[PDB]
């Protein structure tokens, strides 16, 4: 628990996506399930994700980094895309299970 949480926090800090103002779900690869999960996001969350991704792209183009105060915090992160992606994957697996019977 505590040891695992420490290792996870170290990995989150080591991975640089928090420096660019991004959240973890912004980093996930955009495959079909992720595309549909994004399509299912509420408008406010979709707009927030779009702006955060655009700001990260702008920073990467400038080879700069958001100020240390503005970095995303591991202890204060929202996994907004997790429920939608899990539901999409569940539906796809249900379809496959039906299609294999």
């Amino acid at each position: 628990g505590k040891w695992l949480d420490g290792i996870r926090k170290w990995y989150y800090n080591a991975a640089g996506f928090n420096k660019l103002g991004l959240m973890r779900d912004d980093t996930i690869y955009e495959d079909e399930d992720v595309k549909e999960a994004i399509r299912r996001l509420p408008e406010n969350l979709y707009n927030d994700r779009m702006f955060r991704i655009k700001r990260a792209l702008d920073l990467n183009l400038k080879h700069q980094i958001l100020p240390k105060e503005q970095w995303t915090k591991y202890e204060e992160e929202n996994f907004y895309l997790e429920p939608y992606l899990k539901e999409v994957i569940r539906e796809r697996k249900e379809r496959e299970e039906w299609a294999k019977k």
Partner: protein, 419 residues
């Protein structure tokens, strides 16, 4: 076995089974929710609600529901009138249980995921368009909008402005406030009584009885004229009549069958129908005249519906109107009255013949009355109607304030003022 048994559960769910011994079992859940229970805020909700039968539920997924219903071979359908809404599921005898579960999930825990609702929204327009292909439905909807100023004026089909803006929250609110046990009835034809009791035990735990039930359907002598480019104009002018389930309602029905409601000889204008004979000598171009009659819990509507060429339109309606006036004057023989009573009895029996329509009738009268009325009682009631009662109904139609709705060129159709 041979007679159904209306039973009211302690929850309030009127449950009845017939055991017809047919190979296909048929179970219908008739909720007292309808378009009239909408208001100005959530107008058109019931259309989408009827179109959201196959959406994912709390206990079953949309894919699971569709594939299971197909693989079993049965079918789940939703039929909505202006007062009641029926979920009818038909399957094989040994395949009830599965589909029954689906029914429960569609009516008690229908989680309206907003993305699915948004995806379903465009189909509202297509369904409205295909329904409006028949001019009679369009004119009748306009007539209800132009005759009432409250509940029954709410259209069955979603308004154009509301087509893309029916939020799932409105669907949830409507289901919670209207899909309740005391306003629902479970009717199973093939299903034996104890199995119906078992399946309704699932419905025993639902929302509290007697949900929101407002509005009185106040009458309004208004008009709705369309002014289309159609060569043929279809119009309907109607006056207030008795509520459903009344002796005067039977009088109005017998009056409509005296006037003429539909053809009995294919490719042949009704010789006995007074309206067809009256209009035939009025205009020579193709026409079609009928006595529209609708009865509801709070009100009713009896009137004349005519489809005819625009250049002659007015004439037709006047002629039809005049015919009813004559019956109001007292010129009503006994032979045609007996013929109309025979027509009404035969039509009721023919409708009840088909299992689907029998289920619909049983569900409707279970919702409104709660006690089954056998066809013999209906025949006795219609036979009770006398000539004086029919003349009184015609006089009431002639005297009462009239609401008219027309569609077509409308270059000669009189307004309700000079009707």
């Amino acid at each position: 076995p041979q007679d159904l048994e209306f039973t009211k559960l302690p929850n309030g769910l009127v449950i009845a089974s017939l055991e017809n011994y047919s190979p296909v079992s048929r179970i219908g859940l008739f909720i007292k929710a309808g378009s009239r229970y909408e208001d100005f805020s959530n107008l058109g909700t019931t259309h989408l609600l009827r179109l959201t039968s196959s959406l994912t539920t709390k206990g079953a997924s949309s894919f699971k529901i569709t594939r299971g219903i197909e693989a079993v071979g049965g079918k789940l359908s939703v039929t909505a009138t202006r007062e009641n809404m029926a979920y009818t599921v038909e399957c094989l005898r040994g395949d009830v249980d599965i589909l029954m579960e689906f029914l429960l999930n569609v009516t008690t825990a229908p989680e309206f995921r907003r993305w699915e609702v948004a995806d379903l929204q465009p189909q509202l327009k297509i369904d409205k368009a295909v329904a409006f292909q028949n001019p009679q439905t369009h004119v009748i909807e306009n007539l209800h909008a132009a005759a009432y100023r409250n509940a029954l004026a709410n259209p069955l089909y979603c308004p154009d402005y509301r087509i893309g803006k029916v939020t799932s929250e409105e669907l949830h609110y409507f289901v919670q406030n209207h899909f309740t046990s005391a306003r629902m009835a479970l009717i199973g034809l093939g299903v034996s009584h104890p199995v119906l009791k078992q399946v309704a035990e699932q419905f025993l735990n639902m929302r509290g009885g007697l949900g929101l039930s407002g509005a009185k359907a106040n009458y309004r002598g208004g008009e709705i004229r369309e002014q289309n480019g159609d060569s043929l104009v279809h119009a309907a002018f109607v006056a207030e009549s008795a509520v459903a389930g009344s002796a005067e309602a039977n009088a109005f029905s017998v009056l409509q069958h005296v006037l003429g409601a539909g053809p009995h000889v294919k490719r042949g204008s009704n010789t006995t129908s007074h309206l067809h004979q009256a209009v035939a000598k009025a205009t020579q171009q193709p026409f079609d005249v009928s006595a529209f009659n609708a009865s509801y819990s709070d009100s009713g509507l009896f009137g004349i519906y005519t489809i005819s060429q625009a250049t002659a339109a007015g004439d037709v309606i006047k002629a039809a109107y005049n015919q009813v006036k004559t019956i109001a004057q007292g010129n009503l023989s006994n032979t045609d009255v007996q013929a109309a009573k025979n027509k009404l009895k035969a039509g009721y029996l023919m409708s009840v013949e088909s299992s689907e329509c029998f289920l619909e009738e049983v569900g409707s009268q279970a919702l409104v009355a709660g006690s089954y009325m056998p066809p013999s009682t209906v025949l006795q009631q219609i036979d009770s109607v006398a000539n004086a009662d029919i003349i009184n109904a015609a006089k009431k139609f002639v005297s009462g304030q009239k609401s008219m709705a027309a569609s077509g060129n409308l270059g000669h159709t009189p307004f309700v003022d000079e009707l």
